[PDB]
Amino acid sequence: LYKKSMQEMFIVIKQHDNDCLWRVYAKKALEDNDFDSAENAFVQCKDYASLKFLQRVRELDDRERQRAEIQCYFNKVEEAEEIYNKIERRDLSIQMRMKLGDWAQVVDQIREGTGQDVELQKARLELGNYYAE
Amino acid sequence: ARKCYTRIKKLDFIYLLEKAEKDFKKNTFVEGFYQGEIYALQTKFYEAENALTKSNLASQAKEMWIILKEFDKAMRITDTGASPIN
């Protein structure tokens, strides 16, 4: 994989046809920001959620949001937040943190950042509900 | 639904929930399509296909099966379903 090209490795993996090999091939294809090979790996693995995720990703404009969203998809939220900070436009960071459901982190982010009364009040109410539950 | 899908870290289900809550106010929000999507988010494709064929959603089942690159089974499905457009 790290030496040869993509199509040869695809035909080489075809005989083995193992779940781990397909997963690693898809991970490598996504790391190199290649979607055609990733889609082929995902169909060969028969994973509908991965196909939905790839279809959602493909309709993007910039080069930075795709990488951050992929990082957040794998397991890593901190890398996505760091790249969001690199590209600025922090409202995406706050919206993603709200969507993922972590309420302490968004409370930390909103404090001394913009002074939004309504957003801070809603975040604190949600955090209080989460702590009460 | 949001609380349950948030207490365990899930990304596709919460996106589908956001789509459902956005489409509830305006569109019809037929529960058959969302039941089929819930079933298809797992590996149980045939149950989703049966539920989708149940009420009337042939064409959307065809289109959702095509994106999985299984044109043969999608063809078997589109042999029976019609296209009432024009």
Q: What is the 3-state secondary structure (H, E, C) of A84-123?
A: HHHHCCHHHHHHHHHHHCCHHHHHHHHCCCCCCHHHHHHH
Cα separation, B30 vs B24, in Å, equals 9
Residues of A with Cβ-Cβ distance to B41 under 8 angstroms: 48-49
At residue A88, φ and ψ (nearest 5 deg) are 60, -150
Q: What is the resolution of this structure in A?
A: 3.6
Does B67 contact A at CB distance below 8 Å? yes
Cβ pair B11:A73 closer than 8 A:
yes
A30: tokens are 């996504």
Cα separation, A109 vs A104, in Å, equals 9
Token match 């009420």: residue?
A: B55
SS3 state at A31: helix
Residues of A with Cβ-Cβ distance to B19 under 8 angstroms: none
* Under 8 Å between Cβ of B5 and B34: no
The distance of A99 to chain B (nearest Cα, Å) reads 8
Cα separation, A51 vs B49, in Å, equals 17
Cα separation, A131 vs A64, in Å, equals 35
Does B6 contact A at CB distance below 8 Å? yes
* Under 8 Å between Cβ of B5 and B13: yes
Residue from A73, A10, A16 nearest A37 by CA: A10
* Under 8 Å between Cβ of A57 and A69: yes
Cβ pair A43:B68 closer than 8 A:
yes
Cβ pair A51:B67 closer than 8 A:
yes
Cα separation, B59 vs A61, in Å, equals 30
Which of left, alpha, beta for A46 (phi over 0: left; psi -120 to 50: alpha)? left
Expt. technique: cryo-EM
B47: tokens are 């149950």
Cα separation, A40 vs A51, in Å, equals 10
Residue type at B59? Answer: S
For B12, the closest of A39, A52, A99 (CB atoms) is A52
